[PDB]
Amino acid sequence: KTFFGQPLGLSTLFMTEMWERFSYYGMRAILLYYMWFLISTGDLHITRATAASIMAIYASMVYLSGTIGGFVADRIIGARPAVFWGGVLIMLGHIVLALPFGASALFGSIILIIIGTGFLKPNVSTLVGTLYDEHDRRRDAGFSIFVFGINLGAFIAPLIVGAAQEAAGYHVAFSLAAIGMFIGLLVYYFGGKKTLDPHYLRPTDPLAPEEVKPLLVKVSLAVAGFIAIIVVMNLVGWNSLPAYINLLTIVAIAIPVFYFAWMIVVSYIPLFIAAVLFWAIEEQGSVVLATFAAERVDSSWFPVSWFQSLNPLFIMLYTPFFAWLWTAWPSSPTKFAVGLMFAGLSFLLMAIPGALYGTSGKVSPLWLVGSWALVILGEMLISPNSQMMSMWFLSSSVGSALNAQLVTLYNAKSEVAYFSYFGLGSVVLGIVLVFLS
Ligand SMILES: CCCCCCC/C=C/CCCCCC(=O)OC[C@@H](O)CO
Ligand SMILES: CCCCCCC/C=C\CCCCCC(=O)OC[C@H](O)CO
Ligand SMILES: CCCCCCC/C=C\CCCCCC(=O)OC[C@H](O)CO
Ligand SMILES: CCCCCCC/C=C\CCCCCC(=O)OC[C@H](O)CO
Ligand SMILES: CCCCCCC/C=C\CCCCCC(=O)OC[C@H](O)CO
Ligand SMILES: CCCCCCC/C=C\CCCCCC(=O)OC[C@H](O)CO
Ligand SMILES: CCCCCCC/C=C\CCCCCC(=O)OC[C@H](O)CO
Ligand SMILES: CCCCCCC/C=C\CCCCCC(=O)OC[C@H](O)CO
Ligand SMILES: CCCCCCC/C=C\CCCCCC(=O)OC[C@H](O)CO
Ligand SMILES: CCCCCCC/C=C\CCCCCC(=O)OC[C@H](O)CO
Ligand SMILES: CCCCCCC/C=C\CCCCCC(=O)OC[C@H](O)CO
Ligand SMILES: CCCCCCC/C=C\CCCCCC(=O)OC[C@H](O)CO
Ligand SMILES: CCCCCCC/C=C\CCCCCC(=O)OC[C@H](O)CO
Ligand SMILES: NC(=O)CC[C@H](N)C(=O)O
């Protein structure tokens, strides 16, 4: 009695993540349009460009939080409590948007989810690994099934939440996200006590006595430095929302710079950059492509948010092939290059409808279908150890930090140039990074 060849525990963690991803990507699929709505009612006094920037820096902070989430669980509170309380915080974040409020609830929701996802996401991934011995070949297959589940939740969420939004409004749809996380907590809590090892109720690598003080010092100085900067910003009149997003952008990008300066490994640099650039493009699906979907495609007969299901749809379709592919077959730097090339191609493709049909009309949904087909093909060359997982979340974070700057450039007037430039740039950088490495 297994779960697709794996210990029954995989099913628990599988569904936990699926429902977490459900709530996250359900919310993500309507959050931009929601902000558009708040803007249209004079409730939110920002440009659409800034709204787009918010989406990206939101994702960036979510991934940055995940970069330290593993650390907190492994050394302070434990992997199993981190997932649980992480889940609770996420649930609360969605509940906040379900409440009959407007723009004033946005920040609180974002904070809870950043902290919550930071606690949950790296650590459920950790718990998957705990289901096996250090020497078991199923480890790869098991984690592959796990990722299939992550995308299963990401697939159905925009369909369900998107349609719900169109039926009963935004707050009801957001509450469905909350309910989804609640389901995940149920399956995780009761299922976990039966499948998961109890040694992960506590930190497996607790802070040694002499480690606590210098850690505390470094956190204090960092937080103090950050706050001092914000003070200065408010004194000199740089306190607009983009100002804060720029601050966050700089912080997120500075982190690998000083983190890589620390070990300087120089072979890791092009790998990191390729990942950063790939995730930048991939994460623009929920922002730039979401915008294209709403403005440049006729979605008069279906929720336009449904386009967000295409990304994880292709993960699920490619998984059977690529599984067989690896059984029946490329260097790590090669995989990243070709992957980034596909990402670039996915944007070059998106440049065609505007150049061929103009930008003032509407084009076939198949353009976005083909685009996601291309970038997810690239993800297959990138997508599937506490330390490496951290670099993974970090690369994702920097990509979205970059997006926070980049997506503000996107509009109907700049559409073709935007997709062409960053599309061809990514293809070229793909070529450069494969030979540089
Ligand atoms: C088939 C799956 C293989 C994965 C890679 C495929 C990527 C290829 C994408 C090209 C398709 C995009 C073109 C869509 C298109 O032009 O249709 C527009 C319109 O004519 C349809 O009515
Ligand atoms: C894991 C470390 C993260 C450190 C930063 C903590 C979170 C800081 C900012 C959250 C990023 C969201 C900025 C956009 C935003 O707040 O929008 C608010 C609404 O527009 C209300 O006007
Ligand atoms: C366990 C360590 C981290 C603790 C996480 C606590 C998160 C800190 C602040 C989140 C702010 C949540 C309150 C915001 C809120 O409720 O929305 C505002 C009103 O509902 C809108 O009128
Ligand atoms: C302890 C688990 C909590 C999970 C339940 C979260 C959702 C709970 C109740 C649903 C709240 C739905 C709000 C409905 C609402 O805001 O009115 C709808 C619009 O304002 C007008 O159509
Ligand atoms: C306003 C929402 C607040 C909800 C608080 C509910 C708290 C109820 C019980 C606390 C249980 C916390 C421990 C759960 C945990 O560590 O997960 C491990 C479980 O053994 C299953 O893996
Ligand atoms: C607003 C954030 C400012 C930065 C937070 C800095 C302070 C955060 C946590 C302080 C933790 C208390 C240090 C003492 C300690 O952890 O010992 C507890 C051990 O478990 C004792 O056995
Ligand atoms: C550990 C729980 C408390 C930690 C979170 C408290 C708030 C933390 C940082 C505040 C946000 C810092 C970046 C500024 C920012 O996001 O802008 C927010 C919007 O400008 C709101 O108007
Ligand atoms: C150990 C990593 C820490 C590195 C932190 C580096 C932060 C250095 C400078 C941050 C300056 C904040 C930028 C503020 C800003 O861009 O405001 C400009 C606004 O766009 C004007 O409206
Ligand atoms: C080796 C020492 C050098 C430290 C490297 C830190 C990296 C600093 C900045 C990264 C560039 C991203 C800034 C983009 C940005 O936020 O634009 C805002 C402008 O600063 C003002 O409009
Ligand atoms: C596994 C089978 C389910 C496949 C359908 C998944 C649908 C998910 C998102 C749909 C997003 C909008 C795509 C619309 C579409 O493909 O129609 C294309 C028509 O040829 C339009 O002329
Ligand atoms: C393997 C399939 C990949 C398909 C993508 C390859 C597409 C190749 C080039 C697309 C770039 C077309 C841009 C056309 C263009 O820039 O028009 C300029 C006009 O002046 C519009 O402002
Ligand atoms: C695994 C490598 C992926 C290679 C992609 C294979 C497809 C190659 C080129 C497809 C280019 C699609 C351009 C769309 C196009 O030109 O048609 C325009 C519209 O159909 C007008 O009716
Ligand atoms: C990569 C070698 C290490 C040196 C890093 C120093 C510069 C760090 C990051 C460079 C990318 C900065 C992205 C910000 C950017 O492109 O701004 C775009 C505009 O601000 C859009 O408004
Ligand atoms: N970029 C990442 O690190 C994670 C993205 C992936 N789509 C997920 O939700 O798990």
Author numbering: 6 to 269, 282 to 346, 351 to 405, 420 to 472
Sentences from the paper on this structure:
The structures were refined to maximum resolutions of 2.7–2.2 Å, and were either in the inward open conformation (PepTSt[Phe-Ala], PepTSt[Asp-Glu]) or in an inward-facing partially occluded form (PepTSt[Ala-Leu], PepTSt[Ala-Gln]), which mainly differs from the former by exhibiting pronounced bending of transmembrane helices 10 and 11 (TM10 and TM11) (Lyons et al., 2014, Quistgaard et al., 2017). An overlay of the structures reveals that the peptide backbones of Ala-Phe, Ala-Leu, Ala-Gln, and Asp-Glu overlap strongly with each other, while Phe-Ala adopts a markedly different position. Yet the glutamine side chain is bound quite differently than leucine: Tyr-68 and to a lesser extent Trp-296 have moved closer to it, thus narrowing the pocket around it and enabling the formation of van der Waals interactions as well as a putative N-H···π bond mediated by Trp-296. In addition, Trp-427 and Ser-431 have undergone rotameric shifts in order to form hydrogen bonds to the side-chain amide.
Proton-dependent oligopeptide transporters (POTs; also known by the acronyms PepTs and PTRs) are ubiquitous in bacteria and eukaryotes where they play an important role in nitrogen acquisition through proton-coupled uptake of di- and tripeptides (Daniel et al., 2006, Smith et al., 2013).
